Design an enzyme around this catalytic site. Sequence first.
Site, PDB file in Angstrom:
ATOM      1  N   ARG A 151       3.110   6.781   4.539  1.00 33.84           N
ATOM      2  CA  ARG A 151       4.082   6.560   3.487  1.00 33.84           C
ATOM      3  C   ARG A 151       3.440   6.605   2.127  1.00 33.84           C
ATOM      4  O   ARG A 151       2.244   6.405   2.016  1.00 33.84           O
ATOM      5  CB  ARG A 151       4.752   5.184   3.645  1.00 33.84           C
ATOM      6  CG  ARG A 151       3.879   3.993   3.395  1.00 33.84           C
ATOM      7  CD  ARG A 151       4.463   2.705   4.013  1.00 33.84           C
ATOM      8  NE  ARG A 151       3.697   1.506   3.691  1.00 33.84           N
ATOM      9  CZ  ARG A 151       2.609   1.110   4.315  1.00 33.84           C
ATOM     10  NH1 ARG A 151       2.064   1.820   5.287  1.00 33.84           N
ATOM     11  NH2 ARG A 151       2.000  -0.009   3.923  1.00 33.84           N
ATOM     12  N   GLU A 177      -9.753   7.633   5.830  1.00 39.35           N
ATOM     13  CA  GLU A 177      -8.393   8.094   5.810  1.00 39.35           C
ATOM     14  C   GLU A 177      -7.871   8.251   4.399  1.00 39.35           C
ATOM     15  O   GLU A 177      -7.119   9.173   4.121  1.00 39.35           O
ATOM     16  CB  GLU A 177      -7.517   7.092   6.564  1.00 39.35           C
ATOM     17  CG  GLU A 177      -7.824   7.030   8.046  1.00 39.35           C
ATOM     18  CD  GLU A 177      -7.155   5.856   8.718  1.00 39.35           C
ATOM     19  OE1 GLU A 177      -7.305   4.716   8.227  1.00 39.35           O
ATOM     20  OE2 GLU A 177      -6.489   6.067   9.742  1.00 39.35           O
ATOM     21  N   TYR A 233     -11.139   4.102   2.235  1.00 39.45           N
ATOM     22  CA  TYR A 233     -10.612   3.242   3.284  1.00 39.45           C
ATOM     23  C   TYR A 233     -10.422   4.033   4.552  1.00 39.45           C
ATOM     24  O   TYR A 233      -9.927   5.160   4.514  1.00 39.45           O
ATOM     25  CB  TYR A 233      -9.275   2.682   2.796  1.00 39.45           C
ATOM     26  CG  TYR A 233      -8.494   1.898   3.821  1.00 39.45           C
ATOM     27  CD1 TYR A 233      -8.615   0.533   3.888  1.00 39.45           C
ATOM     28  CD2 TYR A 233      -7.582   2.522   4.656  1.00 39.45           C
ATOM     29  CE1 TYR A 233      -7.897  -0.203   4.810  1.00 39.45           C
ATOM     30  CE2 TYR A 233      -6.840   1.788   5.579  1.00 39.45           C
ATOM     31  CZ  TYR A 233      -7.017   0.426   5.654  1.00 39.45           C
ATOM     32  OH  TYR A 233      -6.285  -0.310   6.524  1.00 39.45           O
ATOM     33  N   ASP A 240      -2.097 -10.880   8.588  1.00 37.72           N
ATOM     34  CA  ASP A 240      -0.832 -10.482   7.984  1.00 37.72           C
ATOM     35  C   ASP A 240       0.227 -10.259   9.067  1.00 37.72           C
ATOM     36  O   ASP A 240       0.050 -10.716  10.195  1.00 37.72           O
ATOM     37  CB  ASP A 240      -1.067  -9.255   7.107  1.00 37.72           C
ATOM     38  CG  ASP A 240      -1.661  -8.105   7.853  1.00 37.72           C
ATOM     39  OD1 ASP A 240      -1.487  -7.963   9.081  1.00 37.72           O
ATOM     40  OD2 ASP A 240      -2.382  -7.254   7.246  1.00 37.72           O
ATOM     41  N   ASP A 289      -6.191  -8.335  10.775  1.00 35.39           N
ATOM     42  CA  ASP A 289      -6.226  -7.100  10.034  1.00 35.39           C
ATOM     43  C   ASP A 289      -7.463  -7.067   9.165  1.00 35.39           C
ATOM     44  O   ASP A 289      -7.390  -6.839   7.965  1.00 35.39           O
ATOM     45  CB  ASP A 289      -4.944  -6.995   9.224  1.00 35.39           C
ATOM     46  CG  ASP A 289      -4.624  -5.590   8.840  1.00 35.39           C
ATOM     47  OD1 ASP A 289      -5.363  -4.673   9.254  1.00 35.39           O
ATOM     48  OD2 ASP A 289      -3.642  -5.352   8.136  1.00 35.39           O
TER      49      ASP A 289
END
Lengths: 160, 160, 160, 160, 160, 160
Positions: F31, F9, F43, F85, F90
């Site tokens: 964002r 991504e 990533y 988190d 995660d």
Amino acid sequence: HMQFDVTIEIPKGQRNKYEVDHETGRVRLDRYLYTPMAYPTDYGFIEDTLGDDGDPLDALVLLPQPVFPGVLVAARPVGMFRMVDEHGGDDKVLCVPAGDPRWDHVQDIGDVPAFELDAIKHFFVHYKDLEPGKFVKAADWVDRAEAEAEVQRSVERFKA
Amino acid sequence: HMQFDVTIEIPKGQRNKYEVDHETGRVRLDRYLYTPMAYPTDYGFIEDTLGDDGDPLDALVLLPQPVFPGVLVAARPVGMFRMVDEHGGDDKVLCVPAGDPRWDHVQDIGDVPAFELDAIKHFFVHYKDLEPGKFVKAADWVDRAEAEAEVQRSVERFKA
Amino acid sequence: HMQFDVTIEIPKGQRNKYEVDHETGRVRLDRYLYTPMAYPTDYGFIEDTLGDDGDPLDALVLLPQPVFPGVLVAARPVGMFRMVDEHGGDDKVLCVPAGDPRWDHVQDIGDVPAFELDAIKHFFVHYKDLEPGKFVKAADWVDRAEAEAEVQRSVERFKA
Amino acid sequence: HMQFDVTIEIPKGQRNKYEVDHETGRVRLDRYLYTPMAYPTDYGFIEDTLGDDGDPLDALVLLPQPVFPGVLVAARPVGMFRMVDEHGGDDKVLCVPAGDPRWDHVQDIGDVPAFELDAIKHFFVHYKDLEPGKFVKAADWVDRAEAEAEVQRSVERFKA
Amino acid sequence: HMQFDVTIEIPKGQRNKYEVDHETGRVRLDRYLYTPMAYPTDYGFIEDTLGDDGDPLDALVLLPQPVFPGVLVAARPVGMFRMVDEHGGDDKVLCVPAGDPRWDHVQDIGDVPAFELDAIKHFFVHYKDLEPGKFVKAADWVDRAEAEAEVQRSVERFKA
Amino acid sequence: HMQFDVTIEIPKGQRNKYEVDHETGRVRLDRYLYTPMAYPTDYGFIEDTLGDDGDPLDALVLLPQPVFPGVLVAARPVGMFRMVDEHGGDDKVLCVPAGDPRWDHVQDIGDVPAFELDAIKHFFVHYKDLEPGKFVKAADWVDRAEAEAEVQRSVERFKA
């Protein structure tokens, strides 16, 4: 009315810490940063200054597009990031391009949004986190008048 | 046979108008352009010239890949964009790399396609449209012989 | 309250005019522009709209960093560039990222500086100057309410 | 213990062969390469050397991110590409950044993977394939001790 | 008159060998090349073809500016690089943008300079030099008529 | 022996947080980050997984050159960043390209230098520092066996 030339060492978005060897004017790679961070603004120093740490006075310049290492920009101050770290005093004068009416709404530190000031602060607080023997003892934003006074004393010391 | 060194100030595709301070050789950001335009070719000036406006003679260099601000390129002229604007005379010598056989089919102004010449003209006619107090009174392409004569008188004036 | 997804076809700074084939979602190079111009903002269209020209409703998105062709951005309108050209109606809704508090000071067309609006206008007025059979009969900025009404009728037509 | 300053002329990934005019320090475009190849590492020369061919001693610097043409990097040698071509001797000292603990596992030529050494060799063997009057008579990797001896004799000759 | 859509997998200048998984249309990184080479043109395949090797027919597209992986370009053929390698037949149709008058002087293989054809050939002859079990048994340029015939039989096979 | 497809991504070096809408496969800008940080590796996520948080299992891929958003890479795991988190669990599986012998020395977490692991950790610990309502309760590196077990249970859940 105050303006001065800034030499940009490090364009916004860089993890290569460029930089000038002040004895020769050559651009040097100091190091690749050890943290996954990138300079938040174009970064460099004010020409013909002898600052509070005995080094040229550092500057941050807000721009619509970054420059290249070694490029001069006529700039005017709008505030300053006051910081004490392992170097000693390590202030960064915050600037905008001089003579450019697109920046006329930015006159003092209150004219720069907190999101931007906070991101700049975050960079300087954290970018050396993974280097040994580093610290930050004070980091705060101050106004244009404080910035101008620092530039002024540094211009005088350079000339002395 | 004529060739000369061009210092490229502005790589093709730039909206930052870089640049040289001719007294020092430093590269400066003059300004970010006010129009959504970008230099159509690598752009700079011919070293050791004193042109018709009392400034170094400007040059455009056709290249397969742009350079960086401040880079020298040995070039040969193939024509010239004659222009009168608010500066006064503001001619731009059109060049190709000297000694590079890949460019040997480009000898004079007729060897550069109209689509390219027209795009270059369009840039210079429009890039200052949103700056006050600018104008273009004459803008025309002329041939290699005219270009060479301008280079020649500018080399002579520099030496004088 | 209005927000919608924009597909960006063309990142800010591009002279390649990308794009989407709306039947397949594929990204296509329409053409390299014929003028030395570059898109002034990220540019694309609002998903699930059938606009005034029978095409998806175009959008401009103000961003701190451009995206890639084909990327979605949730956006909210702040005004619109109304234009009539050779296509017919060719309006571009001006937007900012939705849900991003950094943009909360930008609510309506008066919140975008004239230097920016004028540069955007200049792009659309001039980018086809060197293409045959092109024209611009009307080009003006209108407010958020007009923009929202156009989005609304275009969402309705898409659904009809 | 040996370290020296390298001026990088050509960042990794370049097909523009930049570079320095050693009489002035200016960066020049020598040529665009004639083969579809790109420099495999940042490439330049060791400052204050007079090498085996009467030219500054060339250097390759392994880096996590390339620099810009003209940038200095303090470097230490880990081996050398010995080559004889149409210039004569044309050795390239292989280096890593000095004082950077991230590189401490790279001390000698055996610490650089064959895939990397082979790619570097391939570049120098082939990049001039489509230029007339070029040849490569010897191309081999040698160790740090050989590299250091060449640097040493070249520093001495520069000083002589 | 012949034109077709090319999907560009690999922009000019890439060492990442992207790609399309033809069953899904997804873009994949096949591998980073093992040689210090970069694709000489934008590279991909002709949509809706079943070529001589049972794979989509490969294409090279000459462009003024590269695209992104996955982008469609309407193209017309001007010649073909015929090659037999370890895959088997591995021809690459050489193309220019269709409907773009800037390319109208390029109609057949003689209209592309030898420097460019030779660089393209060099890429395909050498880029796998440092991969085991690779070879090139035939590599030659052929004309537009041969190219068109290959496209035609490949369109027919796709439809069959 | 384990390998899988990762969709990247976010290329290394990005401050734009791209991303995929998993219902459609479209790439979205989530964002622009609020901190002056950039993704330390390419990533994304492992295709056909349903992870511990009910989302696709995230992946980091070490590469010599970044890809583009949406690109697939066949990868194999060498360890995992375990983190809890504000989302919940995660975890990020650390990977290298599968089938690429240049990576054969990287088999398990001890084969990745601490400088690199520490920089990756620093990114995830700090990148949301200037977003409200974020926290990190646990962040630690674990080995390939733990990574493989997480991939395995996530492949099973996806299929269930």
